[PDB]
């Protein structure tokens, strides 16, 4: 018998309450980061490793630049919620 909430995984572009940054020209930071990591490691890294790397890339490589002082040099950190009960690999 297994829990009805088990084996779900949510990857949010940002933590609860914050703003999610998106470049109208190059798309959002989260997606840019997710796609690059996936294009290069989607088949050899476990889901959590990938999402952790995405976390790092979004945290470092990104920092906004706006006119309004309220939106300048702002950062972002994605959030992963996992109820998985096994390691996930998109291969073999």
């Amino acid at each position: 018998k297994i829990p009805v909430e088990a084996d779900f995984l949510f990857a949010y572009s940002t933590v609860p309450g914050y703003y999610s940054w998106r470049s109208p020209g190059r798309g959002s930071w989260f997606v840019q980061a997710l796609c690059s990591i996936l294009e290069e490691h989607g088949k050899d890294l476990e889901i959590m490793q990938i999402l952790t790397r995405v976390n790092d890339r979004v945290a470092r490589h990104f920092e906004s630049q706006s006119d309004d002082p309220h939106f300048h040099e702002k950062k972002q950190i994605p959030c992963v919620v996992s109820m998985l009960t096994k390691e996930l690999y998109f291969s073999q």
Binding site: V31, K75, E87, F90
Partner: protein
């Protein structure tokens, strides 16, 4: 023994909901660049092995139907399921083009006791939406 079994015919279905244009009644502006994201995402997930389909500017009823139907399909030969929501968001809710819907309502359809063919299989949700208005200033 410690990894999900990927020994299946299909990797799984991947639903991408890409909301860019919202009703004036919502007061939400156009989400420029979301199409750039949707396309990139389509290639990545397709490339991983997902049978991805992209639905655009969905209403809240539309998204509920898409996820309900998808949960009623037969995933016996699927290794997992994935859903990607690109839209406007607020704490605990995602934006349809005609209003807002609870994320928990979209994902609930796949609970163990409501989607037998995905039982013990991974169900992934990638949400690219806002969750609040607070800004992370950073440090150092």
């Amino acid at each position: 023994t410690y990894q999900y079994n990927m020994n299946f015919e299909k990797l799984g279905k991947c639903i991408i909901i890409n909301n860019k244009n919202f009703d004036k009644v919502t007061g939400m502006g156009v989400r420029n660049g979301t199409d750039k994201d949707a396309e990139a995402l389509f290639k990545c997930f397709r490339s991983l092995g997902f049978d991805v389909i992209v639905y655009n500017d969905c209403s809240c009823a539309k998204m509920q139907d898409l996820l309900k139907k998808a949960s009623e399909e037969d995933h016996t030969n699927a290794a997992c399921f994935a859903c990607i929501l690109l839209s406007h968001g607020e704490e605990n809710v995602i934006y349809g083009k005609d209003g807002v819907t609870p994320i928990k309502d979209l994902t609930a359809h796949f609970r163990g006791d409501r989607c037998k063919t995905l039982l013990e299989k991974p169900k992934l949700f990638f949400i690219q939406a806002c969750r609040g208005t607070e800004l992370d200033d950073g440090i150092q």
